[PDB]
Write a protein that binds this DNA or RNA. Structure first.
Lengths: 71, 71
DNA sequence: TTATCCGCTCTACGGGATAA
DNA sequence: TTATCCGCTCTACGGGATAA
């Protein structure tokens, strides 16, 4: 887990976690009451994705987040 | 820096960093080409805030973020 | 200094759903 | 399986700006 500085870097990182665990977009979506299309749009077009969607997808991936220095 | 699980927890944490450094919303806003109103709305109503706004405010606070296990 | 307002445009996200 | 579509409503975020 490296430091993340943009929505694109964030989406790429979270997509990788999903793929490394063999999870489909539908699995996660159904687990958190979100559309599959919303996850697809987050992974490919995260710039305008809301924080709510982000944190729900975080939960489905069994992940959390912390702040840190930009170094 | 604790683990964060929601937009509200995120906004509270980042607001605290701003206050601990004596920064005003206008200072940060001008540094990243964002409206002051956008920062105010993020700190008080973060649920629908876009990821772009979030990462821009992150930069102004000289912060970054990492993913981690939800434990 | 910050919460809050106006009027505008754009898009996310829900509801549907599909191709291959 | 996932990118992508339709039509809808809501709101964020830019442009203005204010009170105290």
């Amino acid at each position: 887990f490296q430091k993340i500085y943009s929505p694109t870097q964030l989406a790429n990182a979270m997509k990788l976690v999903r793929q490394q665990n063999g999870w489909t977009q539908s699995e996660l979506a159904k687990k958190i009451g979100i559309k599959q299309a919303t996850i697809s749009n987050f992974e490919n077009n995260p710039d305008n994705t809301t924080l709510t969607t982000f944190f729900k997808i975080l939960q489905s991936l069994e992940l959390s987040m912390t702040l840190c220095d930009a170094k």
